[PDB]
């Protein structure tokens, strides 16, 4: 797809869950650079 | 042309990235279905991704967007989880990494919550979970996320019912 006319991206902002942070969408691969590669495990709650 | 450089845990840069990761875990409304049940991560490794060609591709576009947006690139650091991570660090982001069914349009998606991106490490909806155990909440297998520099430029604000 393409971004809205006159726009370079979309900001998707949760309006119901007040603890949920934003998500963002770009429509050109060149607008992102993969700066860090993070290797991890999720931890089981104690 | 990609080189991966290990950051030391004693490095402030390593510590800053881990803090971004840990501090942006939240609870999800699927109760952990897609990404698993957890409040924090065990960070095993953080590597800087170095590719001169991919960087110049990025900064060239950043300059275009910046000038189109009146000298404001609106650049962020954001998370991205994907089964395609290893293709991304070598070849860069492209249409193959678009989310066709995304509720904000068919583009490439990034998140401020590390735990939101964790939901996509094994694919949409967490796919079938880790390869080895088929467990979306696996505590054994190693996962990878990208922490990315993203140019937003003029961004359209879409509120969502989430
Ligand atoms: C693997 C694909 C490309 C789908 O084929 C996936 C990657 C992805 N990664 C995120 O971190 C994210 C974060 C928030 C919202 C959506 C996403 C998506 C949606 O697209
Ligand atoms: Zn596993």
Swiss-Prot record, chain B:
Poly-ADP-ribosyltransferase involved in various processes such as Wnt signaling pathway, telomere length and vesicle trafficking. Acts as an activator of the Wnt signaling pathway by mediating poly-ADP-ribosylation of AXIN1 and AXIN2, 2 key components of the beta-catenin destruction complex: poly-ADP-ribosylated target proteins are recognized by RNF146, which mediates their ubiquitination and subsequent degradation. Also mediates poly-ADP-ribosylation of BLZF1 and CASC3, followed by recruitment of RNF146 and subsequent ubiquitination. Highly expressed in placenta, skeletal muscle, liver, brain, kidney, heart, thymus, spinal cord, lung, peripheral blood leukocytes, pancreas, lymph nodes, spleen, prostate, testis, ovary, small intestine, colon, mammary gland, breast and breast carcinoma, and in common-type meningioma. Highly expressed in fetal liver, heart and brain. The gene is TNKS2. The chain holds residues 952 to 1113 of 1166 of the full protein. Ubiquitinated at 'Lys-48' and 'Lys-63' by RNF146 when auto-poly-ADP-ribosylated; this leads to degradation. Deubiquitinated by USP25; leading to stabilization. It is found in: Cytoplasm; Golgi apparatus membrane; Nucleus; Chromosome, Telomere. Disulfide bonds: none annotated. Zn(2+) binds at residues 130, 133, 138, 141. Belongs to the ARTD/PARP family. It comes from the Eukaryota. This is Poly [ADP-ribose] polymerase tankyrase-2. Changing residue 103 to V: Loss of activity. Residues 8-162 form the PARP catalytic domain. Oligomerizes and associates with TNKS. Interacts with the cytoplasmic domain of LNPEP/Otase in SLC2A4/GLUT4-vesicles. Binds to the N-terminus of Grb14 and TRF1 with its ankyrin repeat region. Interacts with HIF1AN. Interacts with RNF146; this interaction leads to ubiquitination and proteasomal degradation. Interacts with NUMA1.
């Amino acid at each position: 797809a393409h971004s809205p006319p006159g726009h370079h991206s979309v900001t998707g902002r949760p309006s119901v869950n007040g603890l949920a942070l934003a998500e963002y969408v770009i429509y050109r691969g060149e607008q992102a650079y993969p700066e860090y590669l993070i290797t991890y495990q999720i931890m089981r709650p104690e | 042309g990609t080189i991966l450089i290990d950051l030391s845990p004693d490095d402030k840069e390593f510590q800053s990235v881990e803090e971004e990761m840990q501090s942006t875990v939240r609870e999800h409304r699927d109760g952990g279905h897609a990404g698993g049940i957890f409040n924090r991560y065990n960070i095993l490794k953080i590597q800087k991704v170095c590719n001169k060609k991919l960087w110049e591709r990025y900064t060239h576009r950043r300059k275009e967007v910046s000038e189109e947006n009146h000298n404001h690139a609106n650049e962020r650091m954001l998370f991205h989880g994907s089964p395609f991570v290893n293709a991304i660090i070598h070849k860069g982001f492209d249409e193959r990494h678009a989310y066709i069914g995304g509720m904000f349009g068919a583009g490439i998606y990034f998140a401020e919550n590390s735990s939101k991106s964790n939901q996509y490490v094994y694919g949409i909806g967490g796919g079938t979970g880790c390869p080895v155990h088929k467990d979306r909440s696996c505590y054994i297998c190693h996962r990878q996320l990208l922490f990315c520099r993203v140019t937003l430029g003029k961004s359209f604000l879409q509120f969502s019912a989430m």
